[PDB]
Amino acid sequence: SPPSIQCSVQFRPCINIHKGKVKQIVGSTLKDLDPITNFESDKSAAEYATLYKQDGLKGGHVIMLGADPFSKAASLEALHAYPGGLQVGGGINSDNCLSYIEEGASHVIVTSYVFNNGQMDLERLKDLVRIVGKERLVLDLSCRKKEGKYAIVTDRWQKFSDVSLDAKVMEFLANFADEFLVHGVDVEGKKLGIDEELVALLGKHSPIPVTYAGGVTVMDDLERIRTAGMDNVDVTVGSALDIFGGNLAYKDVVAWHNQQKVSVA
């Protein structure tokens, strides 16, 4: 709870593009293998990107949710507005991963492509690193408590894998990923608070930077990210931000992000 001169928890914004529009939803209600929608807008994804660039927020992510091809064009708008500022995910694979780097993304975020038959596919994973480099790959290990563990979920969170999120998995995938992104899908988009157990896990055993996402609702929940995460876990807020129809002031969340860069001088 008291500040840290060494560590600084980053706010990592998001842009959730579904069927061509910017939305925030309860992602666990997507059934495309109607989702509960928290917010829709016709504002171009490029305007959210420009806002983040203005406030110096780096390492946020654009998600192309679903197969609709108009989501691809809206994502390139945001990446073109904020070159190098955004990670981009949503159906990244071997054949298109490099293309997203060449459109201004700093990273691609991957889950489903590196999973086959419920297992981590080592050869697919090595193909990403070969093409884009580990430094431009983010692995998303979003998960859901199942039989006492955190099972990783694939295919837009509509399939349980057979890999559980634990220390041994993170030590291994860290040889292939610059960073980890982890949604607590049970609580995601539902504006009810966060998963403290998952954040505590991510902060104890992740050897590379890890962003938690899901259910951040009030400013006090940002202080739990610090507390449970031992100042090791970055945090995403989506459905609660006032710019996505919530009650949480985006400007307050930015101020909190800058308050974490504590300088003695």
Ligand X SMILES: NC(=O)c1ncn([C@@H]2O[C@H](COP(=O)(O)O)[C@@H](O)[C@H]2O)c1/N=C/N[C@@H]1O[C@H](COP(=O)(O)O)[C@@H](O)[C@H]1O
Query: Where does this chain bind ligand X (CB under 6 A)?
Result: 14, 16, 24, 27, 30, 63, 65, 89-92, 109-113, 140, 142, 154, 156-157, 181, 183, 188-189, 213-216, 236-240
Whole-number minimum distance, CB 151 to Na ion, in Å?
Answer: 20
Whole-number minimum distance, CB 129 to ligand X, in Å?
Answer: 15
**C-alpha span between 224 and 235 (Å, rounded):** 10
Whole-number minimum distance, CB 260 to ligand X, in Å?
Answer: 19
**C-alpha span between 157 and 31 (Å, rounded):** 9
Whole-number minimum distance, CB 30 to ligand X, in Å?
Answer: 4
Q: Is 189 in the site for Na ion (CB under 5 A)?
A: yes
**C-alpha span between 224 and 38 (Å, rounded):** 24
**91 contact partners, CB below 8 Å, separation of at least 6:** 64, 67, 112, 113
Q: Is 24 in the site for Na ion (CB under 5 A)?
A: yes
Q: Is 184 in the site for Na ion (CB under 5 A)?
A: no
The length of the chain, given as a count of residues: 265
Q: Is 238 in the site for Na ion (CB under 5 A)?
A: yes
Q: Is 115 in the site for Cl ion (CB under 5 A)?
A: yes
What is the rounded end-to-end Cα distance, in angstroms, of the chain?
A: 21
Partner from Na ion, Cl ion, ligand X, none contacting 115, C-beta within 5 to 8 A by type: Cl ion
**C-alpha span between 21 and 16 (Å, rounded):** 8
Residue closer to Cl ion by CB (options 1, 117) is 117
Distance from the Cα of residue 122 to its chain's centroid: 22
Q: Is 11 in the site for Cl ion (CB under 5 A)?
A: no
**C-alpha span between 178 and 167 (Å, rounded):** 16
Candidates 18-26, 53-61, 89-97, 170-178 — which segment interacts with Na ion by CB under 5 A? Answer: 18-26
**Angle value at C-alpha 115, between 87 and 167, nearest 5 degrees:** 80
Q: Is 236 in the site for Na ion (CB under 5 A)?
A: no
Binding site for Na ion (CB under 5 A): 24, 189, 238-239
